[model samples]
Target: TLTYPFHDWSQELSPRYAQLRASDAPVCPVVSEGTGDPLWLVTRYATAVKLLEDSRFSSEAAIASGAPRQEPVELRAPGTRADGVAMLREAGLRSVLADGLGPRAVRRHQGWINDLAETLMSELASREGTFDLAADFVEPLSSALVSRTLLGELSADERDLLAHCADTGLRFCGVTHEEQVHAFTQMHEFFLEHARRLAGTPGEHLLKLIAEAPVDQGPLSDEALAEAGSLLVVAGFPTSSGFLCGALLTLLRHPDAVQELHAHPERVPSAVEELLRYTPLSTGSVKRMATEDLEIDGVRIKAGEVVMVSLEAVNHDPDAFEDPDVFRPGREGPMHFGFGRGRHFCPGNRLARCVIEATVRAVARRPGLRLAVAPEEISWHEGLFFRRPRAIPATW
Candidate 1:
């Protein structure tokens, strides 16, 4: 069996993805290097999309015992919420969750998001010489957007503690089980306190909306409300920050795009979509398990077997794009799975786009923004499910 993760932490799509995508069996068997357990790896775009949308392939089942997984332990991060989709469906929160982040909400929040991005960029401008863009700007801005937009304004101390939890919560293989559990417990505690604070209160944020939504079961329990908040915090921060860091690096590599975008401010939104298509935020596959026997590209997947779909691979599939390796910003095809697809698509995608679009526009508008260090000299965070640059030592 092939070793899972397929490759290590890097923005470059693995050559293995192409070989697998082109092979007769697109859904090939692999073993999780971290756990030595076997699973199916889907490489082709069509098969991957179908597998994701199929209800017979259960994400919740992947958490069940004896299922193959990439991480050493079962996911302890409350935000991963392996069972969240099914639960949301049963509780009829699917529409509520999507509506909370829908176009209307995006329009309402766009001005604030743009303001936040410009403000962060302005702070970066005051700094002399070299500064870590990921640290000084992207990470904090991401945290702030998620916190203030979703949970309302939180104390700096509260934000700091929650940021720590969000950072630690993403780790699985690198950290000990005890450390993971402690982080999970701490995250839960913070959310519970925040949930209580929001209970019977009025607000326009997503969490507040969730708290006030009428359900047949009546008011959600404290734990349920806290879990909703926990999902938003942990999922929103690190992933958004990771994508922003990657997006900035992509622009730095293409100086012409920066100059062009700066010249035409209207181009930022489409450029953001292209960035989403090109950047690779996930280090591994999106895991799902087959609920029943299925076949893909003439390969059979047994019931209860885990299926790992590499969205990064699908995004880069030559069959899906014209000159897939080239970064042609305006050219378009089917939408990439950057925010995922089907029922479990990232709920914060619109908000994420607003954040990224605003940030990219800010970078383009700022003169002299470039990497202070060689691209090869920059480092990455390892062993986390998502890949992100540790620091972007940049100068303007």
Candidate 2:
């Protein structure tokens, strides 16, 4: 029953998360089939935000206690050897990503993002009738943008390997415990080799920065380095990919907004914000543990409990934004949890925003661009931490 509920929560959360706005109903409770159950969901915007900002809720607690109940398969054993390595890899990857997508690098990628958008638009415009936008346009465009911006000069094999690991990692998101363990082992091996190679010869890009950074300067261990690479691959690809697909689908569904944006590209930034507010990628938080009994929105949460904030629900709360269900690009100031918040807010937000903004502009500029299939006909990939359409069929 719990497993099925977990699956259901993962599936229904995204498609209907917006509709759950203003409700504090816990999306899912932390339950052990026989052990016990805990109230775990915080759906309202303010409560979610408070929960995220509260220092009493510690991410490290979950890693240490294994308290927050994920799908049994998703949980790693406490003190596992690979667990340490995984943490290191994540830390290292964060460093590498920070260097590349740091404020400076994002500014640098602006022109490249714009150029790629133009190139993609031109290719799409030349198409005779219809094309699978997800495959032909968005995927390639996103792939190229990430590869060119971050990996720098990775060979074709390296690029493909990274993509494979990313795809496999996502597919493993909601799988059985045994499957996740197997996937983790396979993924670790793939990154181990790549990290070693990158470590040997630090180049001029982010990988080089990670490789060459002084050990005394909080450099990453080999295991950590590998994990970081894999994390970046997953992070860099599907997120922007999903946002691009969602934005395009939204525009095609509402040509009026498309026309408004096309008439004035300057509105791209605000438009991007609006789109993010309307269709955030996930309903789950990054996973945090309570260090002490804490009260949030009048509910007392016991210490050491796992809390997963639903960003999808919070962002759509009516109290947070007027007509939260409506999509109105360029509608005032910050109105979404699309990129998260606090210390863990997406570091690559600028890059993602740039990439997405460019893609939206390009698609909008192309005359006669339309969806290749009915919105209802399109299928979305389920269970992965991120929300994404399996494929977006579109054409000009």
- Local accuracy of candidate 1 as per-residue lDDT tens digits, 1-396: 678775567687678888888888778887888788888888778988888898788877886545778766655443445344455566678777766787877888889888988988888898766788898888778877876567666678877877777666566456776676677678777777777685444447777777777788876777777777677776777788888999989999999888888898888888888888888888788888888898765778888788888888888888888887777787678888888789778878888888898899889999679999999998987766677888999997
| Alpha-carbon TM-score of each model against the true structure | 0.92, 0.84
Name the regions of candidate 1 deviating beyond 4 angstroms.
Answer: 63-66, 77-82, 198-203
Model 2 lDDT tens row, 1-396? 232123322223444344344345534454532224353666677767777777788766665534645433443222334343246344544465566777777676778778877887788778787777777778777777666664455666766666654444554244555565555566567667666575555334555556565554466667666655555566677677777777777778878888888899888788888877776565245667778887766667788777776666776677777877778885764557888777667777877887878887886686578888887788877665466778777776
Q: Per-candidate RMSD vs. true structure?
A: 2.4, 3.9
Best by TM-score: 1
RMSD versus native structure for model 1: 2.4
Look at candidate 1 and give me any clashing residue pairs.
none
Q: What lDDT would each prediction earn against the true structure?
A: 0.78, 0.64
